[PDB]
Structures are given as C-alpha cells and as structure tokens.
Amino acid sequence: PGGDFSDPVTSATLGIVQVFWGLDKKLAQRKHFPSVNWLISYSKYMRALDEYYDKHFTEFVPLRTKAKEILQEEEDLAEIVQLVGKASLAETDKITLEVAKLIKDDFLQQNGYTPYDRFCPFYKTVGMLSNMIAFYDMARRAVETTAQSDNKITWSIIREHMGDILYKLSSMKFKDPLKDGEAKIKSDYAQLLEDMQNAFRSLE
Amino acid sequence: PGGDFSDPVTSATLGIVQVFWGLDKKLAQRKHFPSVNWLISYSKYMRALDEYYDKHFTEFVPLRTKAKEILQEEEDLAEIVQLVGKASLAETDKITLEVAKLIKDDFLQQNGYTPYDRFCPFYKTVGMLSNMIAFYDMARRAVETTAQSDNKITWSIIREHMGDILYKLSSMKFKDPLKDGEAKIKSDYAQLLEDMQNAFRSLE
Amino acid sequence: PGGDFSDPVTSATLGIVQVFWGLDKKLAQRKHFPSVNWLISYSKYMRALDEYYDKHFTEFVPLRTKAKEILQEEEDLAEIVQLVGKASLAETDKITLEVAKLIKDDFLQQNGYTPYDRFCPFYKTVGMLSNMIAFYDMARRAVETTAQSDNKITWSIIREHMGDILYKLSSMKFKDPLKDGEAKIKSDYAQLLEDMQNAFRSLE
Amino acid sequence: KDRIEIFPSRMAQTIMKARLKGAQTGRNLLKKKSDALTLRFRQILKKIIETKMLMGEVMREAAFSLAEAKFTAGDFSTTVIQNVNKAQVKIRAKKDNVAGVTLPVFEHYHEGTDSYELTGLARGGEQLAKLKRNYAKAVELLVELASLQTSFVTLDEAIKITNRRVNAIEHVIIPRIERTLAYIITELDEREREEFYRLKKIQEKKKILKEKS
Amino acid sequence: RGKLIAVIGDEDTVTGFLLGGIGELNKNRHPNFLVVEKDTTINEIEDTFRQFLNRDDIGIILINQYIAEMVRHALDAHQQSIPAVLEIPSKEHPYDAAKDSILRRARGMF
Ligand SMILES: Nc1ncnc2c1ncn2[C@@H]1O[C@H](COP(=O)(O)OP(=O)(O)O)[C@@H](O)[C@H]1O
Numbered sequence: 037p038g039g040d041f042s043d044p045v046t047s048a049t050l051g052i053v054q055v056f057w058g059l060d061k062k063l064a065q066r067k068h069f070p071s072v073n074w075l076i077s078y079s080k081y082m083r084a085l086d087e088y089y090d091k092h093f094t095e096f097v098p099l100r101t102k103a104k105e106i107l108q109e110e111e112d113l114a115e116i117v118q119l120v121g122k123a124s125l126a127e128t129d130k131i132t133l134e135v136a137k138l139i140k141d142d143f144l145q146q147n148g149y150t151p152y153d154r155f156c157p158f159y160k161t162v163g164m165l166s167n168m169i170a171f172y173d174m175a176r177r178a179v180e181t182t183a184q185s186d187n188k189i190t191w192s193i194i195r196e197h198m199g200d201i202l203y204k205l206s207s208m209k210f211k212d213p214l215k216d217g218e219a220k221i222k223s224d225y226a227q228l229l230e231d232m233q234n235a236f237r238s239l240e
Numbered sequence: 241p242g243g244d245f246s247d248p249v250t251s252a253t254l255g256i257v258q259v260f261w262g263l264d265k266k267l268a269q270r271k272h273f274p275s276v277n278w279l280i281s282y283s284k285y286m287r288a289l290d291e292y293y294d295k296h297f298t299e300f301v302p303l304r305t306k307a308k309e310i311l312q313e314e315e316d317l318a319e320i321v322q323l324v325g326k327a328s329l330a331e332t333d334k335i336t337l338e339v340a341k342l343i344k345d346d347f348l349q350q351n352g353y354t355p356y357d358r359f360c361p362f363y364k365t366v367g368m369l370s371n372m373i374a375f376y377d378m379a380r381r382a383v384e385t386t387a388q389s390d391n392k393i394t395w396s397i398i399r400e401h402m403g404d405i406l407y408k409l410s411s412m413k414f415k416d417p418l419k420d421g422e423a424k425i426k427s428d429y430a431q432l433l434e435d436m437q438n439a440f441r442s443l444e
Numbered sequence: 445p446g447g448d449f450s451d452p453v454t455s456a457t458l459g460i461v462q463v464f465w466g467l468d469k470k471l472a473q474r475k476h477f478p479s480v481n482w483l484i485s486y487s488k489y490m491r492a493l494d495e496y497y498d499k500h501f502t503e504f505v506p507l508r509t510k511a512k513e514i515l516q517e518e519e520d521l522a523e524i525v526q527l528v529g530k531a532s533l534a535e536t537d538k539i540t541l542e543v544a545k546l547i548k549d550d551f552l553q554q555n556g557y558t559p560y561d562r563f564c565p566f567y568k569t570v571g572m573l574s575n576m577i578a579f580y581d582m583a584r585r586a587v588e589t590t591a592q593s594d595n596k597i598t599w600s601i602i603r604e605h606m607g608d609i610l611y612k613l614s615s616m617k618f619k620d621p622l623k624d625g626e627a628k629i630k631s632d633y634a635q636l637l638e639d640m641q642n643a644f645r646s647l648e
Numbered sequence: 649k650d651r652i653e654i655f656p657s658r659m660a661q662t663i664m665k666a667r668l669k670g671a672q673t674g675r676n677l678l679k680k681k682s683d684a685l686t687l688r689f690r691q692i693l694k695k696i697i698e699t700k701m702l703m704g705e706v707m708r709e710a711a712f713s714l715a716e717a718k719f720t721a722g723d724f725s726t727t728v729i730q731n732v733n734k735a736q737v738k739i740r741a742k743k744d745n746v747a748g749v750t751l752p753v754f755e756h757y758h759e760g761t762d763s764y765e766l767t768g769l770a771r772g773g774e775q776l777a778k779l780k781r782n783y784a785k786a787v788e789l790l791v792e793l794a795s796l797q798t799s800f801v802t803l804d805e806a807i808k809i810t811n812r813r814v815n816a817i818e819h820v821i822i823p824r825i826e827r828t829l830a831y832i833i834t835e836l837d838e839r840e841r842e843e844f845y846r847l848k849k850i851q852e853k854k855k856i857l858k859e860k861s
Numbered sequence: 862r863g864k865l866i867a868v869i870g871d872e873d874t875v876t877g878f879l880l881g882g883i884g885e886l887n888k889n890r891h892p893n894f895l896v897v898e899k900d901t902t903i904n905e906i907e908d909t910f911r912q913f914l915n916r917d918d919i920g921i922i923l924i925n926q927y928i929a930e931m932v933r934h935a936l937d938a939h940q941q942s943i944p945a946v947l948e949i950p951s952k953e954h955p956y957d958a959a960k961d962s963i964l965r966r967a968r969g970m971f
Pocket residue numbers: 069070146147148149
C-alpha cells in the first residue's frame with residue numbers, strides 16, 4: 037500500500053524468497069519498462085548457475101560483473117553531479133556516465149508490446165552485452181593511454197568521431213529474433229564490432 | 241500553526257470556501273493597512289458578478305484585470321532588480337515599477353482613523369482606479385511609440401513634465417464622500433483626466 | 445533504549461534527580477573517556493556547595509565559570525569553522541580554540557586504568573584548572589592590549605615564544621599523588637605559574 | 649531520492665530536525681558570504697571602468713606628445729628595438745583576502761638598471777626625459793589595472809561557485825530533509841492508531857466478560 | 862621580480878614602453894614584443910600570443926586594441942587570471958568598450 041516496501045506482507049515475503057525483483061514507479065512514469073530497480077534487487081541463485089554459464093555461454097559472467105560495476109559507479113557519480121554539476125569530472129567518469137546511460141536505455145529497457153522485443157533469446161542478450169562492454173573497454177583504454185600526452189583523446193572527440201557507431205549500438209535491440217533469425221543477428225553483431233574496432237583505430 | 245495551511249481544518253476550509261482574504265503580519269509591521277497580501281488572496285465569485293458590473297459599473301472589469309497584471313509584474317520583477325543592478329531596466333519596466341507602487345501606496349492602502357477613508361463607495365473606487373490605469377496606459381504608449389525616433393522618452397521626462405498630475409493622483413484619496421457630493425467627485429476626477437490627457441499631448 | 449532523551453524512564457527520572465551526568469555517543473566513538481557531554485549534563489548543587497568552596501578552595505568558582513564559558517564559546521565557533529574554514533578569524537577566537545583544546549585533551553580527558561589518573565585529588569584538579577585559566581587570561585590580555593600598536597601579537601608568535609610552557613601544561617596530568625605528594629605537586633604547579641608569568645612578561 | 653533512509657522513531661525525528669536546522673543556518677552563512685563577494689565585485693567593476701577611461705585619455709596624451717620629442721632626436725627606432733639590455737620595471741604577486749578568498753594582485757618592485765642612458769645627450773634632452781617619465785608612470789598605472797582585472801576574474805569565479813552551493817542546499821537538500829520529516833510524523837501517527845485499537849479491544853473483552861459473568 | 866611585463870604593439874608603442882622601461886630579452890634572445898606591420902600574418906600573431914601565455918614568467922601582457930581585433934578568438938579562449946591581458950587604445954582607433962574580454966563578464970552591470 038502506497039508503494040512502501042516496508043509493509044507487513046513485503047517484509048514477511050522478502051525473508052522467505054530467494055529472488056527479489058523490485059519495481060520502481062519513477063521508472064514506470066517515464067515508461068522505462070520493465071521498471072526493475074537494479075539497485076535494490078538481488079538473486080541468491082547467481083552462484084548455483086556458474087556451471088551452466090561456463091558450459092554453455094562461457095563469456096557471460098565477466099560481462100555481467102563488468103556491467104554491474106558500471107551501473108554501481110554511475111550512481112556514485114550521479115549524486116555528486118546533482119550538487120556540483122558535470123564539470124568537476126574526469127574523462128573516465130564522463131565515459132562511465134555515457135556507457136551507463138547506453139546500457140540503461142538500450143539494454144535494460146525492453147518494450148514488450150512490439151514484434152521485435154516481445155521475446156529476447158539469451159544469445160541476443162549476450163551479444164548485445166558483449167558489443168556494449170567492448171565499446172566501454174576500447175573507449176576507456178583510448179582515453180587512458182593518451183592521458184599525459186598532448187593529444188588527449190577525450191569523450192567529446194570519441195563522440196563526434198563515432199556518432200554513426202553509437203546509433204547502431206542503440207539500435208541493436210531492433211533486430212527481430214524471428215524475421216532475421218539467429219545467424220543474421222549474430223553476423224550483424226559481429227560486423228558492428230569490426231566497425232567499432234576500425235573506428236577506434238581511426239582516431240589514433 | 242505558524243501560518244501553515246496543511247492542518248486538516250485549514251485544508252478543509254480552504255477546499256470549501258470561495259473567497260480567501262489573506263491577512264499578513266509582514267505588511268502589518270510595515271504600517272501597510274489593511275494588511276491584505278494581494279498575492280495569496282483570491283476570490284472565485286468574480287464570474288457571478290458580471291451582469292451586476294456590466295449593468296452598473298461597465299468600465300471596471302478591464303481595470304481589475306489590468307491592476308492585477310501590474311501588481312503581479314512588479315513582483316516577478318524582483319530578482320531582475322536584485323541579481324542585476326537596477327540599470328538594465330526597459331522603460332516599460334520602469335513605468336510598471338513606478339505605477340504599481342503608486343497603486344500599492346494610494347489605492348490598496350486605506351486609513352480608518354480619518355474622516356474620509358473610513359468608507360470608500362464604489363463609484364469613488366472605480367474612479368480612482370480608472371484614473372490610475374488611464375495614466376499608466378497613456379504614459380506607456382507615449383514611450384513605446386517613440387521607441388526609435390531620436391526623441392527617446394523615459395520616465396525621467398514623464399516625471400518632470402507632469403509633476404503636479406502625479407501629486408493629484410497621489411491625492412485622489414482625500415476627497416470626502418460626505419463633505420463633497422458624488423457629482424462633485426465625479427467632476428473632479430473627470431477634470432483630472434482631461435488635464436492628464438492635455439499634459440500628455442503637450443509632451444509629444 | 446537506543447539513545448532517546450524522551451524514553452519514559454529517562455524523562456521520568458530527570459524530573460526527580462538533582463545531578464545528571466550525560467552520555468555523548470560521539471565522544472565514546474572517538475575513544476574519549478569519560479564520555480560526559482558537558483553541554484547537556486547539569487548539577488543543581490553548585491549553589492549549596494558555595495560556602496564549602498569559599499572556605500576550602502576560595503578561588504575555584506571563578507575558574508569553573510570561566511572554563512564553562514570557554515567550552516561553550518568553542519562549540520559556538522566549531523560549526524562556523526566547519527563551513528567557512530577558519531581563514532578569517534580574530535586572534536581571540538584562535539586563543540579560545542587553542543585553550544579549549546587544551547582543556548578538553550588534558551583536563552577533562554582522564555584514564556582510569558593508569559596508576560596516576562585513577563583518583564585525582566581535588567587539589568590536583570584545582571591546580572590544573574588554575575594554571576590553564578591563568579594562561580588563558582594572560583594570552584588573551586597580551587593579544588588584546590597590543591591590538592593596534594606596533595608588532596601586533598598573534599597566536600602564532602605565542603606558540604613560538606612559549607612552546608615548552610605549553611608542554612608543562614599539557615603534562616600536568618602525569619604527576620602522581622602517591623609517589624609525589626601534596627606539597628611537592630603544589631610546588632611544581634607554583635613554579636610553572638612563575639615560569640609562564642616570566643615568559644609572558646618577556647615576550648610582551 | 650525522495651527521502652533519506654532512516655526508520656521512523658522519536659529519536660530519528662530529533663536527529664532530522666537537528667539536520668534541518670544546521671542546513672538552514674549554513675544556507676544563511678553562505679548567502680551572506682556571497683553578497684559580500686558580490687559587493688566587492690560591483691565595486692571592482694566601477695573602479696576598473698574609471699581606471700580604463702583615465703588610462704585611455706593618458707594614452708591619447710602620450711600619442712599626441714610622442715611626435716614633438718621625436719622631432720628632436722632623429723629616428724631612434726632601430727636604436728630602441730635592437731638595443732635593449734635590461735628592463736627596470738619588475739612585478740611580483742601578492743594576495744588579498746576577501747571573505748576567505750585570496751585575490752591575487754601585483755606589487756611593483758622598482759628595479760634600477762637603466763641602459764638607456766646615452767639617449768643622445770646633445771640630441772634629445774628634456775624631450776625624451778619627460779617622454780620616459782610619462783611612459784613609466786603609464787606602465788605603473790596599467791600594472792594597477794592588471795591587478796584589478798586579476799582580482800575581478802578570481803572573484804567572478806568564486807561568486808559562481810558559492811551561488812551554486814547555495815542553490816544546491818536550497819533546492820536539493822532541505823526539501824529532502826523536509827520530506828523525510830513529514831514521513832516520520834505520518835508513520836508515528838500510524839503506530840499510535842494500532843495501540844489505540846488493541847487497548848480498546850482489551851477493554852471491550854473485559855466489559856463483555858464481566859457482564860456475561 | 863619573479864615576473865616581467867610584456868608588450869605586443871607596434872614599433873612606436875614598443876619604443877614607448879621601452880621609454881617607460883619595459884622590454885626584455887630571453888636568455889634565448891627572445892623579446893617581450895612582436896612588432897606587426899603590413900608584413901606578417903595572423904597565424905604568427907596567434908602562435909606568438911600562445912607562446913606568450915605558456916611562457917611561465919609573464920604577468921602583464923599589453924596588446925594594442927587594433928591588434929586584437931581579429932585574434933579575438935585567441936584571447937577569448939584565455940580564461941585564467943594571472944596571465945593578465947590589457948587591450949590598449951591609440952590614435953588610429955581609441956578605446957572601444959565593445960570589444961573587451963574583461964568587460965565580457967560584466968553582462969548587465971553597465
Ligand atoms: N514491459 C512492458 N512493456 C510495455 N508496456 C508495459 C510493460 N510493463 C508495463 N507496461 C504498461 O504499464 C501498465 C502496467 O500495468 P500492469 O502490468 O497491470 O502493472 P500492475 O499489475 O502493477 O498494475 C500496463 O498497462 C502496460 O500498458
């Protein structure tokens with residue numbers, strides 16, 4: 037009642053269940069769906085599924101821990117930006133914020149009343165996460181290895197250089213699992229990676 | 241409690257009643273009487289008094305809307321005069337900030353310990369408001385017509401060309417309704433109107 | 445029951461008792477012992493004890509009064525130095541801060557598990573407080589009289605001159621009332637008083 | 649977020665009230681410091697304008713007075729631009745405190761190592777002498793104006809920082825504290841209404857038993 | 862002492878400021894001036910102003926106003942304080958309150 041998770045039934049249930057998907061009304065009012073909180077939710081079966089992921093996908097747990105760390109650092113940056121503005125920020129923080137916004141808007145968000153996003157297989161999920169963490173790694177390495185040098189590749193350079201790549205990273209979610217199939221989706225996600233790598237060689 | 245309109249009784253009574261005269265202590269400490277706030281007060285009976293006004297005092301509702309506009313504009317021009325330095329003042333705003341103070345000091349302020357300001361009939365009220373808003377209108381047009389004419393008029397010329405008109409405006413609230421009749425006060429206000437019109441034509 | 449000053453037991457007790465020694469959780473977290481609040485604690489026997497002090501320790505009541513004033517002024521200045529940051533401070537504020545720190549660290553703070561600070565007799569207490577308050581008075585007078593003269597005295601050219609007088613004060617609490625005695629400790633304190641008097645006479 | 653994570657209790661209420669009072673006294677401190685710096689800024693602006701005007705008219709004086717002293721020593725352009733050993737005007741930095749901010753201004757340590765001593769003893773005398781007097785005084789005056797501009801800039805940025813802090817404490821922090829205070833009041837009011845119901849139940853059962861028995 | 866004044870005017874202005882007493886040569890034989898006439902281009906102006914700024918001993922850079930009229934981009938990008946920069950008038954064009962980078966921050970207060 038009232039959206040308060042401190043009521044008797046929620047308190048009674050959260051001490052019984054092993055997974056907790058906590059929904060947020062702030063994300064529901066902007067039509068950010070599903071409205072999971074991702075900062076209060078948890079799953080106590082994340083260690084019991086290590087064998088399955090190792091034997092079947094084997095490249096996913098690294099991606100998962102990396103994405104969780106990005107989303108956790110963004111909330112430490114945001115409560116500071118809210119008071120002292122987005123000007124005290126290093127370049128790696130400016131990269132963390134933009135990558136977290138990309139993840140939140142084009143990975144976590146999924147409009148389920150569409151022909152392409154009603155269902156999302158796990159290969160498509162791991163592919164999108166792979167292509168979204170590869171960009172993070174490349175951009176951070178570029179902003180970091182030319183730091184003390186005078187050339188200073190910064191986030192605005194990366195952004196005006198790759199404005200054709202970020203749009204594709206955001207539109208990765210528009211690929212039908214049924215009209216395109218598995219092979220076409222995997223090939224398109226493997227081609228976007230080469231585009232990213234060449235575009236990141238281009239500015240160095 | 242402490243001027244907080246959230247107590248259940250105050251919330252209910254403000255939800256019900258149609259008028260709300262907001263007496264303020266701040267205005268009382270400045271010797272502004274009657275200390276009505278004019279900014280948080282309201283009245284929702286203004287559309288029921290429309291056949292009455294249009295049958296008895298035809299030229300009043302426009303003056304009411306104009307006076308409310310002027311008194312609101314003198315107030316939301318507060319940070320403009322504090323966070324900036326009183327100089328970046330468009331002549332329209334000088335005219336406002338002066339005539340609105342004229343209203344605040346010589347229309348909204350009444351003194352019961354007098355022989356003339358215990359009771360103010362409504363013909364006297366509409367006369368006193370019509371002369372003030374007619375001044376405002378003429379002094380505002382005189383400025384915004386000669387906007388680019390090499391004969392820029394500012395409030396400095398208006399306040400020197402009419403130095404007795406302004407006094408007689410600030411002296412309208414001394415006409416006794418008993419020692420002077422109604423036709424007498426009407427004719428006095430009409431004479432003041434025609435003198436205003438003259439002294440505004442002898443300026444252009 | 446968690447630290448509430450309005451527990452029914454605590455509020456029912458404060459209406460009956462004449463002395464209340466209060467608990468400071470912030471002082472118990474920083475390991476300052478005994479963690480007496482000294483700003484909410486009270487005693488209602490300080491007027492019935494007057495003719496005992498006026499007969500046995502006739503100079504103690506002014507020392508107690510001035511110590512309490514210093515400890516309140518420091519608390520007034522603390523939450524100012526927190527926001528702005530101690531740049532623009534009168535020299536008397538510097539002396540207040542640096543004598544209040546002495547009173548806190550060397551007089552109020554005690555260690556019961558040591559063989560010299562287990563039971564501190566009242567002549568020791570009165571002597572320590574007397575020397576500290578005498579230093580406070582001398583430093584304040586020095587900085588106050590030569591305020592607009594040549595060679596303005598400050599707190600920094602006092603910590604230079606008398607740096608070892610500021611050490612026999614910060615080590616008065618190590619004398620032992622059973623290895624030393626009453627007359628020995630009294631002689632030490634009198635000699636220290638003469639020392640600081642000579643230093644303040646020479647510097648000024 | 650909309651509230652501060654705390655649990656409703658009559659101890660959290662006094663803690664939160666203490667926080668609110670502390671924050672809205674800090675707000676007044678910062679709002680006084682900002683207007684101090686703002687007054688200093690508005691003064692610096694006016695006197696900078698006046699010094700600009702006067703040094704401009706001085707520069708026009710020097711412009712129309714250059715030619716007459718030029719007419720008395722030939723053409724010393726190559727002389728002046730190639731022969732320069734050591735300038736004797738120097739400048740150092742000092743500070744000036746304003747409400748805790750350290751404005752940097754300039755001190756004009758006057759050095760003397762005059763190289764332009766030949767200067768045509770018999771070709772250009774009082775003319776060039778008064779000329780260099782004029783231009784040295786002008787150099788010092790523009791040193792003063794430069795120190796004023798440096799102050800101006802640092803004060804202008806510190807004003808913005810302090811106003812940002814004021815607006816943050818006024819629009820982000822105090823509303824959040826007030827929200828989590830109203831919530832605590834509501835939750836305590838809700839805890840009271842359950843004890844009332846339980847005690848009324850106990851009394852009802854008492855007055856049922858005693859009458860049916 | 863630790864800092865020296867520096868000029869960018871014309872021949873007449875640099876000689877006026879040598880008469881005043883400023884004008885100095887680097888231990889690399891670099892001057893505290895760069896005279897400009899109908900000869901040199903604006904790229905030289907702007908990298909000269911750049912090496913004027915980055916030089917960590919210059920405190921007061923004087924620049925005649927009519928010089929700065931086209932390199933406003935070089936000096937508006939300057940936002941620090943201690944590399945003080947004053948634009949100077951002369952007879953060709955006297956002081957203009959419009960094209961100032963230190964009256965830049967006085968928007969409204971006029
Ligand atoms: N994943 C989603 N994709 C698209 N729309 C959604 C999604 N989740 C919720 N909505 C919209 O939000 C509304 C939420 O209603 P509902 O799912 O019944 O929530 P609840 O059961 O909490 O009331 C639905 O009417 C639907 O239109």
